[PDB]
Amino acid sequence: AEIPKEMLRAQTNVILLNVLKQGDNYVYGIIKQVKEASNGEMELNEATLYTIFKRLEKDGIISSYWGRKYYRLTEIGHENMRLAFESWSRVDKIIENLEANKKSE
Amino acid sequence: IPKEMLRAQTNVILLNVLKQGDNYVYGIIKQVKEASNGEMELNEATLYTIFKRLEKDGIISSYWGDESQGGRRKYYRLTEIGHENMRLAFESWSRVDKIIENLEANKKSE
């Protein structure tokens, strides 16, 4: 009953982007805030954040600066989150229709 | 929309088709086409690519179903492991939504 590793990575990506949507942040603060928001259950480790942030920065989704290193969501990242939400909204409607077409038949 | 994102979405849709009930490839494509109102017309070869991986991982299997109009179709089905993975996905993704809600609430506090 463990969550698949690929799925966990997808979830961790979403959580981190939503933290940075809250505001610019540093790794220690992010990990601490996620721990608080998860009632202590989700304790992310630095190594996973550094891997993820390197990719998000490469894809232009986030940027960084010294101010420890602070991270922020770019305009590209905000737009990408908007398009993802819209695209997954349409998927939710497809699944709803599959269920309704089932019950109808 | 990124190619990876489309693949993740196609995976979830196909698993949800099979959760509704066992089906064969032409039937699956038709049900997705109808449920997307024509917006998603999957090609067979993409399903075979995805189904090869899902069968390798024990998430789906296949069997021959005798058709009452004559002949046979290859049916795909979600396995007991596949059903459990979908249950854990729903629970863990639901929890992610709650964490994000909490991050926002903890934000407004200050």
Numbering used by the authors:
A (entry chain B): 2 to 68, 76 to 113
B (entry chain A): 4 to 113
How do the authors describe this structure?
LmrR is a transcriptional repressor regulating the expression of the multidrug ABC transporter LmrCD. In the apo state, LmrR shows high affinity for the promotor region of LmrRCD. This affinity is reduced upon binding of a drug at its drug-binding site, enabling expression of the multidrug transporter. LmrR is a homodimeric protein with the drug binding site at the dimer interface.19 Central in this binding site are two Trp residues, W96 and W96′ (residue 96 from the other monomer), oriented face-to-face at 7 Å from each other.
The LmrR protein contains two unique Trp residues, W96 in the drug binding site and W67 at a solvent exposed position, approximately 30 Å away from W96 and the drug binding site. Thus, W67 is not involved in drug binding. To investigate the importance of π–π interactions for drug binding, the electron density in the π electron cloud of W96 was modulated by progressive fluorination of the W96 indole side chain. We obtained milligram quantities of pure, labeled protein, which allowed, for the first time, the crystallization and structure determination of a set of proteins labeled with mono-, di-, or trifluoroTrp. It provided detailed insights into the effects of fluorination on the binding interactions of the indole side chain.
